[PDB]
Design a protein around this ligand. Structure first.
Ligand SMILES: [Zn+2]
Lengths: 103, 95, 366, 95
């Protein structure tokens, strides 16, 4: 293949087809789909890893959208990347304002 | 009997890399899928804007690298750039 | 009451437990010193997250025959460590911090991209020493460095010794290599195996001594909390050892094996023929024996005389074959020629065979 | 019928390692022999001077290593130090 050549799991062939048939530029350097597939795979590994751990805290062996929301919103620099993204069936971060707590 | 593309099995393989026992439910599958699509469209859109800004006709790894350095915030940017450089370099190492 | 051969082992066990009826004092002083240590450690930025691993257990006697020696493990939360397997050893790894927004106080201990076991150990021991010097009316002495796994050994007064081992905690998946291990599916359950896999794993600083060299900054896996869980919940039936009808002897077999090894090590401590062996080899061998004998009826207390013997034979078999797989890491050979020479193995084989052929006289000699 | 020591057969074995067909004439044998003696006396003399300079009573591999780094010139020094470290390390690897 061509994703194996780069030690990637994301399909460099598909990312090439999408950079080409997507009208992002006339030409696409043959080293671009590799870089992009790697960045996508890194961000997906980041998200899925933080997600997995949260699921494991909820003592569950199956990620569900809530866990993705917990991972994306707890991590500071994933939040800033998806700051304007609502995740379906995601719920919110458990957060009660300190002034509302009893006294 | 057509062929609709999606990053299902790819995200699945990355999952089995990072959590060999944790599954992923079809709805979180769809979320990871739309996340891949969103980030890839952002990065390619910024790479395209870079290319047209400098009057080039090729999206090379230089443009993808600057797109990553523009979109992803600080530490995520540095680590993603490293990962991409390593992948591209390895790709050059083969033939 | 039981099959022939039991009474002697039962008397040994009774004497050993009689040796445990005056611990409250020792255990209390240990609790005090550990609590002081934790109080100080939680104040340092680097060690804000240190905690007791075996919660509510400020002791774990590794030597069944040394009631005044304690074993405690200090866990350290340390999130998201990327492990890199050191030269295909499956048990020794390099630890590299992954991306994390909130700065992790273990930054100071980096050596480039690797977290240096040496520097962590240095800071740990310095903190312990300066805190135990705050103990005005009790001579608590830090023993001199010997290795990395027994990180700190403290001496209280002139009778108590406590081994404090620092461990990193990872909530992440068990390292890829260490998968085929913990084969308790036919003994406890497949679901219990899944649940146990969900529990964190630990890292203890342990230099991997290759023939060419030992790499000072490598870490070894730890599942000793899992070992405790399976030890204290050990039967197929959930009601094991809770009633007279389901009274097993597994724990007794383990205790008797450890006592055998400890006495044989004590007699030959001065000749360095047994230095390399530890209670961990026998504990892993016992776990293999529970794997080979999954049913509780294969561990009826009345068959103690026989059951121990079978365990002994398995241990002897390992000693003859130079093969004892770590129970969680099937590719980690604790009994390989690179860790123990053949001569010491044949020495231990012959001594245990003599003891078994003579109704275990060493149990009574000293 | 005494036993006079000399490095004849040793130099011979190293020769058969590095040139399995080339012999060595008794006079060049004597030269290699005196070379071994000269270099060994230099290195041990410098190791002794190191030890006495730092008020130690043991010539350990540290002193031999610094003696080699002092006597042999640059590249020869580095390669000899590597060879000695490797030999000593291998010696430690046994029992
Ligand atoms: Zn039981």
């Amino acid at each position: 293949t061509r994703s194996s050549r780069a030690g990637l799991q994301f399909p460099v062939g598909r990312v090439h087809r999408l950079l080409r048939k997507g009208n992002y530029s006339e030409r696409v350097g043959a080293g671009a789909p590799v870089y992009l597939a790697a960045v996508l795979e890194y961000l997906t590994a980041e998200i899925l890893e933080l997600a997995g751990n949260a699921a494991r805290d909820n003592k569950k062996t199956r990620i569900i959208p809530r866990h993705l929301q917990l991972a994306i919103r707890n991590d500071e620099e994933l939040n800033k990347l998806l700051g304007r993204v609502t995740i379906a069936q995601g719920g919110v971060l458990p957060n009660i304002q300190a002034v509302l707590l009893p006294k | 009997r057509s062929r609709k593309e999606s990053y299902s099995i790819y995200v699945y393989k990355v999952l089995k890399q990072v959590h060999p026992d944790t599954g992923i439910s079809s709805k979180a599958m769809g979320i990871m899928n739309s996340f891949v699509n969103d980030i890839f469209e952002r990065i390619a859109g910024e790479a395209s804007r870079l290319a047209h800004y400098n009057k080039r006709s090729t999206i090379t790894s230089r443009e993808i690298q600057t797109a990553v350095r523009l979109l992803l915030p600080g530490e995520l940017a540095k680590h993603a750039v490293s990962e991409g450089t390593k992948a591209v370099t390895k790709y050059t190492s083969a033939k | 009451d039981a099959a022939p051969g039991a009474s002697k082992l039962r008397a040994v066990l009774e004497k050993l437990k009689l040796s445990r009826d005056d611990i409250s004092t020792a255990a209390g002083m240990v609790k005090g010193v550990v609590d002081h240590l934790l109080l100080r450690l939680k104040c340092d930025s680097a060690f804000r997250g240190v905690g007791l691993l075996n919660t509510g257990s400020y002791y774990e006697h590794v030597k069944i025959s040394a009631p005044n020696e304690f074993d405690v493990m200090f866990k350290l939360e340390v999130p998201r460590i990327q492990l890199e397997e050191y030269s295909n050893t499956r048990a020794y790894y390099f630890v590299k911090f992954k991306r994390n927004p909130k700065e992790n106080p273990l930054s100071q201990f980096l050596e480039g991209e690797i977290l240096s076991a040496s520097k962590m150990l240095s800071k740990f021991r310095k903190i312990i020493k300066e805190e135990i010097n705050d103990i005005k009316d009790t001579d608590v002495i830090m023993k001199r460095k010997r290795g990395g796994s027994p990180a700190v050994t403290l001496l209280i007064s002139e009778k108590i010794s406590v081994d404090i081992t620092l461990a990193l905690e990872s909530k992440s998946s068990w390292p890829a290599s260490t998968q085929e291990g913990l084969r308790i599916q036919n003994w406890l359950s497949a679901k219990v195996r899944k649940q146990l896999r969900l529990k964190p794993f630990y890292l203890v600083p342990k230099h991997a001594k290759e023939g060419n060299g030992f790499q000072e900054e490598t870490w070894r896996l730890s599942f000793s909390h899992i070992e405790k869980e399976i030890l204290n919940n050990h039967g197929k039936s959930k009601t094991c050892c809770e009633n007279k009808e389901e009274k097993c002897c597994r724990k007794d077999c383990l205790k008797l094996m450890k006592y055998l090894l400890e006495q044989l090590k004590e007699r030959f401590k001065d000749k360095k023929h047994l230095d390399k062996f530890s209670s961990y080899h026998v504990k892993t061998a016992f776990f293999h024996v529970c794997t080979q004998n999954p049913q509780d009826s294969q561990w009826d207390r009345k068959d103690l005389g026989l059951c121990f013997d079978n365990c002994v034979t398995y241990f002897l078999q390992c000693l003859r074959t130079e093969k004892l797989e770590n129970y969680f890491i099937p590719e980690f050979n604790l009994f390989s020629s690179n860790l123990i020479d053949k001569r010491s193995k044949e020495f231990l084989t012959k001594q245990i065979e003599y003891e078994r052929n003579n109704e275990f006289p060493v149990f009574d000699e000293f």
